[PDB]
Amino acid sequence: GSHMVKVSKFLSLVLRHNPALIGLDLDANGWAPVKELLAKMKAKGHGISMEELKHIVETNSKKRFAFSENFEKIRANQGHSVEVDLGYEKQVPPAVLFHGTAEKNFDLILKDGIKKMSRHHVHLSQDITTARKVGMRHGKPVVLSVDAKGMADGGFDFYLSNNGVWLIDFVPAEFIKV
Numbered sequence: 346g347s348h349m350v351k352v353s354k355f356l357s358l359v360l361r362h363n364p365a366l367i368g369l370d371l372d373a374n375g376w377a378p379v380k381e382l383l384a385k386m387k388a389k390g391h392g393i394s395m396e397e398l399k400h401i402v403e404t405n406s407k408k409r410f411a412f413s414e415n416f417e418k419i420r421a422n423q424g425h426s427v428e429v430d431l432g433y434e435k436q437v438p439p440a441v442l443f444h445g446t447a448e449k450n451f452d453l454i455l456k457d458g459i460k461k462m463s464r465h466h467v468h469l470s471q472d473i474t475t476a477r478k479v480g481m482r483h484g485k486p487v488v489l490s491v492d493a494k495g496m497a498d499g500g501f502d503f504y505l506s507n508n509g510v511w512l513i514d515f516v517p518a519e520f521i522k523v
């Protein structure tokens with residue numbers, strides 16, 4: 346018994362999708378009690394102890410798991426893995442999204458579009474006032490709002506980070522409406 350690699354696969358299924366296999370109990374913070382996890386999945390035919398599951402979470406190295414102080418609670422960080430999982434929850438996606446930017450880099454951003462200037466980068470403005478507010482950072486602002494039509498039709502699903510900001514994978518400026 347004790348298939349370490351299978352416990353990890355099974356883990357990512359149980360605490361991250363469907364805890365009901367082993368009877369895992371999920372927190373509001375998206376954590377699961379390890380103590381439950383190894384105990385309940387032990388009964389599920391895994392035969393691992395706390396540190397053996399700690400060994401699974403020790404193989405978290407692909408940035409898909411994490412453990413606590415006593416190691417008594419784990420979170421599998423992953424899901425809507427844009428990066429990993431720090432603020433990419435599939436929430437209510439707006440089709441039309443505003444984005445404040447500034448005028449000299451307006452020429453730049455309307456020429457190139459709000460795109461990869463970092464890995465998975467395009468956070469647009471959730472409100473017109475914030476849009477214009479952030480544009481003022483370089484000097485003169487311009488609001489660049491992508492037309493819902495182009496993006497909804499384009500099959501883009503959007504996601505939001507913790508600040509309630511509207512993210513898209515990439516907005517070519519042709520979809521952007523100045």
Ligand SMILES: NC(=O)c1ccc[n+]([C@@H]2O[C@H](COP(=O)([O-])OP(=O)(O)OC[C@H]3O[C@@H](n4cnc5c(N)ncnc54)[C@H](O)[C@@H]3O)[C@@H](O)[C@H]2O)c1
Pocket residue numbers: 444445446447450451453454457458459460462468469470471475476479480506508510
């Ligand atoms: N304040 C916060 O904590 C927070 C958190 C998440 C998102 N946001 C959002 O981010 C925006 C505010 O700016 P920021 O936080 O990204 O700061 P930032 O300092 O990263 O600003 C980057 C600037 O470069 C511009 N830019 C992006 N692509 C460009 C391109 N291809 N060519 C030329 N210029 C380009 C951006 O429009 C912006 O003017 C708003 O939409 C805001 O809602 C703010």
